[PDB]
Amino acid sequence: PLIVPYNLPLPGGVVPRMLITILGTVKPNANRIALDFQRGNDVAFHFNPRFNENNRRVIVCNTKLDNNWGREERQSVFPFESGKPFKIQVLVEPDHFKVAVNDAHLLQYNHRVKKLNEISKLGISGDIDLTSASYTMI
Ligand SMILES: OC[C@H]1O[C@@H](S[C@@H]2O[C@H](CO)[C@H](O)[C@H](n3cc(-c4cccc(F)c4)nn3)[C@H]2O)[C@H](O)[C@@H](n2cc(-c3cccc(F)c3)nn2)[C@H]1O
């Protein structure tokens, strides 16, 4: 029953084997969801499911450096559904963010921001009811 947009501090930044778990429910008639792993004003990893882009479902991933978005990485496999509960797991690897949704691997995102310890906040926003957001070391 948390509040969106939600800020989850990541003390000391991210590190390989860190597992971030977000539990929530997609709102009815949802338009978009966004996870933003931030390094100061930069966004190291933007994870952005879009429910209506040209009447398609798509997940857009990108990095924002000095107020400029970079080249998008798109995943057409779309495991979110309006009205339904979800679990997003982000596993930090040495070279990638690894994303699984509802216990099924979804995508990996190669680190463009390479100072992982400086990625110290996770912003959670968009059309969801947020149930929980936490992290653990596996
Ligand atoms: O990069 C990610 C960002 O993108 C722009 S939209 C973007 O604008 C560009 C022009 O400036 C391009 O038109 C781009 N594009 C690429 C392609 C394409 C590329 C390759 C192949 C192919 F076929 C098609 N088509 N169009 C658009 O996606 C969003 O505003 C932004 N954002 C999202 C949010 C946000 C805020 C609150 C909640 C939330 F969920 C998200 N707050 N900022 C963020 O998600």
Residue numbers in the entry: 113 to 250
Question: What did the study's authors say about this model?
Answer:
Galectins are small, soluble lectins characterised by conserved β-galactoside-binding site (subsites C and D) within their carbohydrate-recognition domains (CRD, ~130 amino acid residues), and they can form multivalent lattices with membrane-associated glycosylated ligands. All the observed CRDs of galectin family adopt a typical β-sandwich fold composed of two antiparallel β-sheets of six strands (S1–S6, S-sheet) and five strands (F1–F5, F-sheet). Concave surface of S-sheet contains conserved amino residues and forms a primary binding groove to which specific glycans up to a length of tetrasaccharide are bound. In this model, the best structurally characterised subsites C and D are responsible for recognition of the β-galactoside-containing disaccharides, whereas the other subsites (A, B and E) remain poorly understood regarding how they contribute to ligand binding interactions.
Specifically, TD139 displays the highest binding affinity for galectin-3 (Kd = 68 nM), an ~1000-fold binding enhancement compared with that for TDG (Kd = 75 μM), which contains no substituents. The TD139/galectin-3 complex had the greatest number of binding interactions (similar to the number for the L3/galectin-3 complex), including salt bridge networks and van der Waals contacts in the principal β-galactoside-recognition subsites C and D. Specifically, although the aromatic amide of L3 and the 4-fluorophenyl moiety of TD139 are both sandwiched between Arg144hGal3 and Ala146hGal3 in subsite B, the TD139 substituent extends deeper into the pocket formed by Arg144hGal3 and Ala146hGal3. A fluorophilic microenvironment is thereby formed in which the terminal fluorine atom of TD139 can form multiple, orthogonal polar interactions (namely fluorine bondings) with the protein backbone atoms at an average distance <3.5 Å. A displacement of ~0.9 Å of the central carbon (Cζ) of Arg144hGal3 guanidino group seems to accommodate the longer 4-fluorophenyl-triazole substituent of TD139. Moreover, the 4-fluorophenyl and triazole moieties at the other end of TD139 form tandem arginine-π interactions with Arg186hGal3 at subsite E. The fluorophilic interactions and the arginine-π interaction in subsite E probably account for the 50-fold increase in binding affinity for galectin-3 as compared with that of L3 (Kd = 3.3 μM). The manner in which the 4-fluorophenyl-triazole moiety of TD139 is situated in subsite E is a consequence of the salt-bridge networks of galectins, i.e., Asp54hGal1-Arg73hGal1-Glu71hGal1, Glu165hGal3-Arg186hGal3-Glu184hGal3, and Glu58hGal7-Arg74hGal7-Glu72hGal7. In the complex structures of galectins-3 and -7, there are similar tandem arginine-π interactions between the 4-fluorophenyl-triazole and Arg186hGal3/Arg74hGal7. By contrast, the interactions between TD139 and the B subsite in the galectins differ such that the number of interactions decrease as: galectin-3 > galectin-1 > galectin-7.
